[PDB]
């Protein structure tokens, strides 16, 4: 029998090629869009804030010595760090697969911006890393939690703790999973607090927008007045350059694709941001 | 006594014939329409996707060696298979009842497409069976279920799980029976969550359309972004041929009616589909 | 004293006549108008339907034996029966009260049609009786009932069982009393599911119309797609004739008023009709 | 001292007169306006209705004996009764107090009309009394009540019973007290079904108007299709006449004021009216 | 070191006196505005009402003696009374504090008006006092109360009792305290029957206005058709006069300030007012 | 290696200056705005209020002796106090940072006004402190509470207690945190009484504005008719003066910035202010 | 002999009536005339006294610290009292003698002014009495008397003692009898101490004015600086009013003539007033 198996006639048949490269799920970027954005041409920013206001004003008896008050100020420095990564590709690979280049570009670009989010939110603070929202932030006050509160109640309490600093909250940054569990929250009857089975409620809780990014660690939540608490200072926009002569390269038939960016994350009022943890 | 009895005069009376054959209910097809369609002329398809993106983009000190990143790709093959069935009928019958062939055709056609759905959805993966939505799909995360969730809560949970792929779902495929029990879902008060007795709620749950096909196994549910996860590739449309000489027909006054079709089911993004089981 | 008693002058006084005869509540006919109608001129109808479509289509390996399928058919017969009744009245009565004849006709006609409905629905299917919707119908699936379903829930389930045939339900035929006890259905709070005390809810349950006929025995309920599951075949329109010489009439100054009709109830798709019982 | 009591100057002071007589509350007449009205000039009315329509129409075998049906009629008589009362006052009083004349009229009129309503509803049937709604009315069907029905639920069952006569109900005649208790009906939560503290609900229950007349015995209720079940036949409109010579009047300077009226109450369809008793 | 002590110069410092007197809480007068008002110029008022209307109208046999009816009238007198009080102050106090004069006016005025309310509502009826709404009123009917009625349910029953008179109620006179406790009535769910936390419900219960006056004894309630059940007749408006020579005075350097008013309270229909007690 | 650090070329790089000085959360001032305001030029205020009004106004017979009444008055004193504080700054600092003065002013001005709030609310009476709202206040009436009242219910009762004074409540002075835990108040079913999870309800409870000041002690609540009950009297408006000669300043190049003000808080009607404690 | 004695024409002559009664009243200064006078519209007076004036003024070397002085003040109160008396006279008398009322007025005022002087001097300072000159005075300094010097010498010594107050003595207040004697004081030879009968002046001793008042207790003497150390404050000048209706006047044809006056007296320096006793 003359079949289609490989060891028979299969060879006479060419598999049909499906144009295109199947790109993975592209994550939606945020956080950065929550912050105030500026632009500089220096390697660092300096701003000044009042540190300690010792207000001793009080009532005074006649003929008596009045109270002495004092104010303190401090200078804060925000450095401009550099983020980047590169890739090396065979002169051949690049020539044999044309579109491969434009693909590698769009990936380093995204990748860069992805790790960028990473700093902005959970910025370690260690040596060269940026200091991010979640680090600068003031801890959530465990005392507001009351016997039997829905996770929803907590975020509420949180929006309040921002008020104690005397500023308006801007939004809520929950983890996609946490957000979900909050929406499907029910009442003692069985009804949906945010939205009956027809459709998921919109991304708005307690009057504020809700940003669900995977960037936010599962089980952690961040509430603040972002648009006014911190600011992102761009020194150099993300860019892609290519070198064929970089060291070894020429003599090895190699290319080097580079992608870098220069930022600076400033935190003006940390009292305006809050990080906390749901107690499960 | 001259009556309408058999053993009397009944014989003189001819029963009135009712035109045509009474065809049973025709199941409404679906699954297929949820997928992307296109045709080919090969015995198999080849598409290419990105495998591992090793993104080391990071923060870099001045004068320091930046980080090296990498990308990986893989070629995936999707084979074409063959679906068909045949009927053997006497030469006598066929000649005596004219429109019988016409009917047998329309019947095999349908019957074929019926089983076609079968594969597309519950495609085993063994031997030759197609790799169907339900197999490819990433398993439902039992983790999301919570103490006291309605079946609807789960479908919801599932709609979410699709998000972890970074694409949105496009429909819910439940079994007609399960769908019913979900619609008649009541609250602690005895009210209908979907529709007060006046009329059944539409086929829309959690913002997404609902596809109730018997094809879907009882107690099994499927949620995903079909229109972007898989594609059906037709090689040869459904067709019908007839043979007078097949096997030992000529010598038995027999005909053979054959109906076949050639497909290929491709699965680009599995992470975009989810298979689950109500556990109750 | 000259009074208006009997034994005085009351005799001189003529009672005023109220024109016309006071006719009892006229019942509203229905069952018939739910079915498809057509006339014939035979003593029986014959039609043919598909019985068992054994569809084995499947996936087939290269150069491997394909699956064999089959189809079955059955010839179904539907006899036409005769419904009628007669009345015997005196020549004298008939002559002394002109309008009496007219009345008697309209009455036999109605009374006949009344019992006609009786057959169409609860037709015993036995001896000479017609085969009624309720005998043909496929029994309600007891497995759909769930802990704590209201009567309403059941008709709901029922409306579904019609779907397993692949046809849409047409209406719900309940007993006038049962309909009532359903409307006054309350929730766990004592609220009226269909309509607060303000006004009775319309005769529409689960999107379908509701037909309340006393014909439907209390405790029994019928749901189906009548408009195309059965058909009524009229052989002889209901008519009225009169004989003066019947039996020994001529010699007793008697008249005989006869009213007959010839029907036939055909049942094409039984899977499209469902009968059940409320077990309270 | 010159005081304003009797013995002193009290006399010089004239009390101020409040114009007009203070009439007691006037009940609002109703039960009459519910029935159909008509004129007559007779001593009584006669009408004819069908009694037993023995309808045996059925299915009949071939060459078999048809079934015999029958009809029964009866003659019903409604007598005309007389209601009235007179009042005699002195010629002096009548001449000295001008408006007393008219006042006395409006009173006898109303008074008559009051007892009139009395007959119409609770008409004994004994001797000379009229036969009224509540007597004729068909007894409520205790079998419709169900464990845990509100008084409202009953009146609903009632409105239905009217339907078993194939006629629509016209209104509900309750006792002002009972109506009240029904409006303040509450649910298991404590909310008012019709009420809701802001204001009393309108006089409409189950789609029908509600007539609250004291005439209706406390604890008794009447539902029916009045405008089509009974008719009031007026022989003589309520009138007022005066006589100066009536018996020893002329010689006693006396007057006699008379007020009479002639009615007849007919009850065509009794099955259209229902009388019941709240049992609790 | 001279300061503001009593030892240094704080003597040369005289406090600044805040102009005028601090008048206490002036309550809202009401009871009066509920009643019909009119003026007169007499020692008292006389009005005439119907007493016993003996209506014997009935059904009368033929040529039989008809029923005799009767009407009784009575003349009711309503006397005018005098309400007043005076206050004497030293010529010195009066001359030394200029505005003390006008203050004593506004106080005697208000004070008078206050006790006026006193009579109008809870008027004793004894000796020289007035008969007040509450004395004349017909007692509440304890039999209307039902197992578990709210205080509101009662006032409701009350509003009905006013119907047995055949007039509509006009308002509800409750005690400020009782009102409050009613407004905050809740359901078994914890919801506010009259108004969710946002705002106190308006002073309207069962469709009627509500007057909360301290005048009304705590635990007591009054519902009636005030606007036309009683009427207030003014003979002399409240007036303030001053005497320099009253008895001693001239020789005791004293002044006498007098404030009087002349009323008359008429009660046309007592069956129109109800007085009851929340018994709990 | 030519780098950016200090040892290399860093020096050539000028950090970008963020214009402006970062001021902390500025608290919103209130309370003072709830009170009536006025001037004065003394070191204390003296006002007069009515104490006991013995109103014997009554009904009097003719020629009868009228009743005598009386009025009592109290004199009350409210002293003027002095609140202030000063800051000593270098002459150089002040000239080298132009806007530093402008800032120090708004900073003292504020701090002053802040401790001012302090007195006005939680006064004391102790020596130099002001006697404030919460001290003068009338105790909350514990008898108004009822089995199962929510915090809200209490403020409600409180808003009533202010009625006994015969004045209207003006606002509710809660502690920021209490207000929060009040808004998130839920019902027996679990849904939010004030705002669901959509958005925070506005600062309005029982129809009155809500004033949340940190000044108000946690757990303490104050309801009253502020705009009527008390009045703030200013002797000296909060002002700021500067001296270059104070003490040994001239010779040490120092400035002294002084900020003081002279108040006096008067409480006319205490019955109009209620203070209470939430017992958790 | 027509003469003018009784028995003749003496009757023709009517005596002329001397128009007007000559009113008494000495020509002398009054304890009043000696004091400073003012006016007030108040119930009392609040003045201030200088107590201790530590005057350390002195000579000072340049570059040297100057001397500190100090002043002490004290707050004093002085109430206003009332002096008055009335006369009851016949209305007839008062009309028949016109000049009579004019007298009674002046005479009642004169008499008032006497008792006025009385309080101004020997004012008990107790209950209703005024705080008089003598109650305040510092006692005379016996240590100034010389071996054998006249009563005159003493008053002279007193005039000196005043000086130690820092005020000049204004006048002398002796008893009439005493003054009469002190004036006729002679030496051991007969020459008058004062001035011979040649050019005798008046009430002037030691160049001061002298008030000879029977108010000044015999044997007592008052010397001080009246014109400045103390002053009279008038609230109401002496006035006369009349009442025709006073108590039972109207009905007795009587008139009541009242004469009152109200003042107060303040003493700014007691040390400036001196009282002593003549030891003889
Ligand atoms: Cl000499």
Tokens encoding A171: 């939004």
Query: Which residue of chain A comes nearest to B270, CA vs CA?
Result: A24
* Resolution reading in Å: 3.5
Which of F175, F173, F160, F172 is closest to F271 using CA atoms? Answer: F160
**How far does the centroid of ligand 1 lie from the alpha carbon of residue G201, in Å?**
17
Report yes or no: C56 and C221 within 8 Å, Cβ to Cβ: no
Chain-centroid distance of CA D17 in Å reads 39
User: Residue F26's CB: how many other CB atoms inside 10 A?
Assistant: 10
Tokens encoding A191: 């009804």
Report yes or no: F183 and F204 within 8 Å, Cβ to Cβ: no
Going from N- to C-terminal start, the domains of chain D cover 30-136+230-268, 137-229+269-280
**How far does the centroid of ligand 1 lie from the alpha carbon of residue G185, in Å?**
15
Report yes or no: G275 and G219 within 8 Å, Cβ to Cβ: no
**How far does the centroid of ligand 1 lie from the alpha carbon of residue G186, in Å?**
13
Q: Does B5 touch chain D (CB under 8 A)?
A: yes
3+ Cβ–Cβ pairs closer than 8 Å linking B and E = no
Buried b (16+ CB within 10 A) or exposed e, E84-112: bbbbbbebbebbbbeebeebbeebbbbbb
**Residue F186 DSSP class:** B
B85: Cβ contacts below 8 Å, ≥ 6 apart: B108, B111, B112, B115, B259, C55, C56, C57, C58, C66, C67, C68, C69
Q: Does D62 touch chain B (CB under 8 A)?
A: yes
Tokens encoding A10: 């299969």
**Residue A135 DSSP class:** H
DSSP letter for each residue of chain G: ---SSTTTTGGG--PPPPSSPPP-------HHHHSEEEE-SSSEEEEEEEEEEE-------TTSPPPP-EEEEEEEEEEEEEEEEEEEEEHHHHHH-HHHHHHHHHHHHHHHHHHHHHHHHH-B-SSSS-B-HHHH-EEP-GGG--TT--HHHHHHHHHHHHHTTT----EEEE-HHHHHHHHT-B-SSS-BSS--STT---SEETTEEEEE-TTS-TTEEEEE-HHHHEEEEEEEEEEEEEESSSGGGGGGTEEEEEEEEEEEEEES-GGGEEEEE---
Enumerate the H helices of chain A as residue ranges.
Answer: 91-96, 100-122, 133-136, 151-163, 176-183, 226-229, 249-252
Determine the Cα–Cα distance for residues B236 and B257; give it in Å rounded to an integer: 18
Strand pairing report for F16-22 and A44-54: parallel
Strand partners, F50: F73
* CA F137-F139-F144 angle, 5° bins: 135
Torsion sign over Cα A93, A94, A97, A100: positive
User: Phi, psi (5° rounding) for residue B170?
Assistant: -130, -10
Which of F110, F46, F60 is closest to F83 using CA atoms? Answer: F110
Determine the Cα–Cα distance for residues F36 and F32; give it in Å rounded to an integer: 8
Tokens 């829930």 belong to C153
Tokens encoding A77: 């420095």
How would you classify residue B63: left for phi > 0, otherwise alpha for psi between -120 and 50, otherwise beta? left
* CA C156-C159-C161 angle, 5° bins: 110
Sheet holding A36-39, edge to edge: A36-39, A230-234, A265-267
Determine the Cα–Cα distance for residues C53 and C51; give it in Å rounded to an integer: 7
Q: Which fold has domain D30-136+230-268?
A: Major capsid protein gp5 fold (3.30.2400)
DSSP letter for each residue of D75-86: EEEEE-EEEEEE
Q: Does E28 touch chain C (CB under 8 A)?
A: no
- How far does the CA of residue D196 sit from the closest CA of chain C (Å)? 13
Find the Cα–Cα–Cα–Cα dihedral E142, E146, E150, E152, rounded to 10°.
-60
Chain-centroid distance of CA E128 in Å reads 18
Determine the Cα–Cα distance for residues D262 and A185; give it in Å rounded to an integer: 73
* CA A13-A15-A19 angle, 5° bins: 150
Determine the Cα–Cα distance for residues F107 and F114; give it in Å rounded to an integer: 10
Which residues of chain C form beta strands (DSSP E)? 16-22, 36-39, 44-54, 58-59, 68-79, 81-90, 138-139, 171-174, 204-205, 208-212, 220-224, 230-234, 236-243, 254-263, 265-267, 273-277
**Residue B147 DSSP class:** S
Determine the Cα–Cα distance for residues G147 and F255; give it in Å rounded to an integer: 71
CB atoms F153 and E184 under 8 Å:
yes
Query: Which residue of chain B comes nearest to F5, CA vs CA?
Result: B62
Strand partners, F82: F262
User: Residue C232's CB: how many other CB atoms inside 10 A?
Assistant: 20
Strand pairing report for B220-224 and B171-174: antiparallel
Determine the Cα–Cα distance for residues E249 and F254; give it in Å rounded to an integer: 73
Report yes or no: G172 and G133 within 8 Å, Cβ to Cβ: no
Determine the Cα–Cα distance for residues D82 and D86; give it in Å rounded to an integer: 13
**Most A CBs within 10 Å, among F8, F24, F80, to test the A interface:** F24
* CA E205-E206-E211 angle, 5° bins: 35
Q: Which residues in chain C are contacts of A6 at CB distance < 8 A? A: none
**Residue A105 DSSP class:** H
Determine the Cα–Cα distance for residues B268 and B48; give it in Å rounded to an integer: 9
Q: Which residues in chain F are contacts of A43 at CB distance < 8 A? A: 4, 13, 15
Tokens encoding C220: 């029994």
Q: Does C187 touch chain A (CB under 8 A)?
A: no
Q: Does E190 touch chain A (CB under 8 A)?
A: no
Q: Does F190 touch chain B (CB under 8 A)?
A: no
Which of E178, E158, E174 is closest to E272 using CA atoms? Answer: E158
Tokens encoding G27: 């020509």
Determine the Cα–Cα distance for residues F35 and F232; give it in Å rounded to an integer: 6
**Break positions in chain F: residue before each gap, C to N over 2.5 angstroms:** none
3+ Cβ–Cβ pairs closer than 8 Å linking A and D = no
Rg of chain E over Cα atoms, rounded to whole angstroms, equals: 27
Tokens encoding F160: 């009533």
Tokens 């006294």 belong to G49
Element (H, E) at C111: helix C99-122
In three-state secondary structure terms, D261 is strand
Determine the Cα–Cα distance for residues F252 and F245; give it in Å rounded to an integer: 10
Sheet holding G70-90, edge to edge: G36-39, G230-243, G254-267, G70-90, G44-54
CB atoms B1 and D63 under 8 Å:
yes
Report yes or no: C150 and C187 within 8 Å, Cβ to Cβ: no
**Residue C184 DSSP class:** T
CB atoms B62 and F1 under 8 Å:
no
What CATH number labels C137-229+269-280? 3.30.2320.10
Report yes or no: D212 and D181 within 8 Å, Cβ to Cβ: no
C187: Cβ contacts below 8 Å, ≥ 6 apart: B189, B190, B191, C193
CB atoms C5 and E63 under 8 Å:
no
Which of C167, D167, D236, A199 is closest to E60 using CA atoms? Answer: D236
Which of C275, B245, C191, G51 is closest to E12 using CA atoms? Answer: G51
Strand pairing report for A138-139 and A273-277: parallel
- How far does the CA of residue G72 sit from the closest CA of chain E (Å)? 5
Half-sphere exposure of D94 (CA within 13 A, CB side): 17
């Amino acid at each position: 029998s003359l079949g289609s198996d490989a060891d028979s006639a299969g060879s006479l048949i060419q598999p049909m090629q499906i144009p295109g490269i199947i790109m993975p799920g592209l994550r939606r970027l945020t956080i950065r869009d929550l912050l105030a954005q500026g632009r500089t041409s220096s390697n660092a920013l300096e701003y000044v804030r009042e540190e300690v206001f010792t207000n001793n004003a009080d009532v005074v008896a006649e003929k008596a010595l009045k109270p002495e008050s004092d104010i303190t100020f401090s200078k804060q420095t925000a450095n401009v760090k550099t983020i980047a990564h590169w890739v090396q590709a065979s002169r051949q690979v690049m020539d044999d697969a044309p579109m491969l280049q434009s693909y590698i570009n769009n990936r380093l670009m995204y990748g860069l911006a992805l790790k960028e989010e990473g700093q902005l939110l959970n910025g370690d603070g260690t040596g060269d890393n940026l200091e991010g929202l979640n680090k600068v932030a003031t801890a959530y006050d465990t005392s507001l939690n009351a016997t039997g509160d829905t996770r929803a109640d907590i975020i509420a309490h949180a929006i309040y703790q921002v008020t104690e600093s005397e500023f308006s909250a801007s939004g809520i940054v929950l983890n996609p999973r946490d957000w979900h569990n909050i929406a499907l929250l029910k009442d003692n009857e069985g009804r949906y607090i945010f939205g009956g089975p027809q459709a998921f409620t919109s991304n708005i809780m307690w009057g504020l927008p809700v940003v669900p990014t995977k960037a936010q660690a599962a089980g952690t939540f961040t509430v603040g007045g972002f648009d006014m608490a911190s600011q992102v200072w761009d020194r150099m926009d993300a860019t892609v350059e290519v070198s064929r002569e970089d060291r070894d390269n020429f003599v090895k038939n190699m290319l080097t694709i580079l992608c870098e960016e220069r930022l600076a994350l400033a935190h003006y009022r940390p009292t305006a941001i809050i990080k906390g943890t749901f107690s499960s």
